[PDB]
Scaffold this active site. Structure first.
Site, mmCIF file in Angstrom:
data_model
loop_
_atom_site.group_PDB
_atom_site.id
_atom_site.type_symbol
_atom_site.label_atom_id
_atom_site.label_comp_id
_atom_site.label_asym_id
_atom_site.label_seq_id
_atom_site.Cartn_x
_atom_site.Cartn_y
_atom_site.Cartn_z
ATOM 1 N N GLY A 34 39.407 39.596 30.900
ATOM 2 C CA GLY A 34 40.365 40.572 30.417
ATOM 3 C C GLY A 34 39.777 41.539 29.395
ATOM 4 O O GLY A 34 39.857 42.765 29.561
ATOM 5 N N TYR A 80 35.648 35.971 28.136
ATOM 6 C CA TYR A 80 35.293 37.123 28.961
ATOM 7 C C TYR A 80 36.362 37.663 29.890
ATOM 8 O O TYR A 80 36.173 38.754 30.420
ATOM 9 C CB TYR A 80 33.989 36.832 29.744
ATOM 10 N N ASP A 92 34.506 43.114 42.501
ATOM 11 C CA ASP A 92 35.835 42.515 42.478
ATOM 12 C C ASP A 92 35.985 41.394 43.487
ATOM 13 O O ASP A 92 36.531 40.342 43.175
ATOM 14 C CB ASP A 92 36.902 43.567 42.744
ATOM 15 N N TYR A 105 39.208 51.541 45.738
ATOM 16 C CA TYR A 105 38.419 51.296 46.921
ATOM 17 C C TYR A 105 39.306 50.772 48.032
ATOM 18 O O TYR A 105 40.456 50.335 47.841
ATOM 19 C CB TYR A 105 37.273 50.297 46.619
ATOM 20 N N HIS A 138 31.405 39.172 36.304
ATOM 21 C CA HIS A 138 32.152 40.392 36.670
ATOM 22 C C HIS A 138 31.951 41.486 35.667
ATOM 23 O O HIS A 138 31.802 42.658 36.042
ATOM 24 C CB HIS A 138 33.655 40.017 36.812
ATOM 25 N N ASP A 139 31.952 41.148 34.397
ATOM 26 C CA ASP A 139 31.709 42.109 33.350
ATOM 27 C C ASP A 139 30.287 42.705 33.523
ATOM 28 O O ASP A 139 30.072 43.931 33.424
ATOM 29 C CB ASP A 139 31.811 41.483 31.981
ATOM 30 N N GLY A 153 36.564 40.601 27.787
ATOM 31 C CA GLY A 153 35.338 39.857 27.558
ATOM 32 C C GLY A 153 34.546 40.559 26.492
ATOM 33 O O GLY A 153 35.057 41.491 25.957
ATOM 34 N N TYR A 168 30.199 45.132 36.509
ATOM 35 C CA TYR A 168 30.683 46.434 36.146
ATOM 36 C C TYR A 168 29.652 47.113 35.282
ATOM 37 O O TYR A 168 29.463 48.316 35.376
ATOM 38 C CB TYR A 168 31.994 46.321 35.358
#
Lengths: 121, 5
Positions: free
Chosen positions: A29, A27, A89, A64, A47-48, A31, A51
């Protein structure tokens, strides 16, 4: 944004995002599928999914603002997308830090065929 | 290097 996230990772862990987290496990980079290989890979899975919760935001390019309050990462108020992307993040960077103890170089450049099956967020 | 998490 991707570059921003990369700097947050480096500041947090002392590892360069590329190549330490850009092609790790199933996952990190790019994923996509399979059972996460270890805790670090699970950080990228989450994290995936994080998002994925933001289909009308653009995490790669949208910048951000955040600050460090001593060591703490504090996301500053921007657009809704920016705020949400920052929290995603921030979580990943903390997750990477919390799992540096089990990070394994053997999972860098992990081949796609060893990642099978859909795991739901 | 612009891409990769």
């Amino acid at each position: 944004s991707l570059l921003e996230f990369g700097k947050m990772i480096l500041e947090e862990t002392g590892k360069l995002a590329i190549p330490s987290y850009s092609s790790y496990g199933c996952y990190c980079g790019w994923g996509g599928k399979g059972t996460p290989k270890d805790a670090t890979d699970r950080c990228c899975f989450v994290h995936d999914c994080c998002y994925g919760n933001l289909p009308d935001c653009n995490p790669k390019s949208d910048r951000y603002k955040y600050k460090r309050v001593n060591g703490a990462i504090v996301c500053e108020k921007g657009t809704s997308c920016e705020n949400r992307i920052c929290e995603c993040d921030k979580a990943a960077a903390i997750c990477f830090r919390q799992n540096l103890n089990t990070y394994s170089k053997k999972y860098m450049l992990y081949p796609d065929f060893l990642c099978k099956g859909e795991l739901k967020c | 290097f612009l891409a990769y998490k």
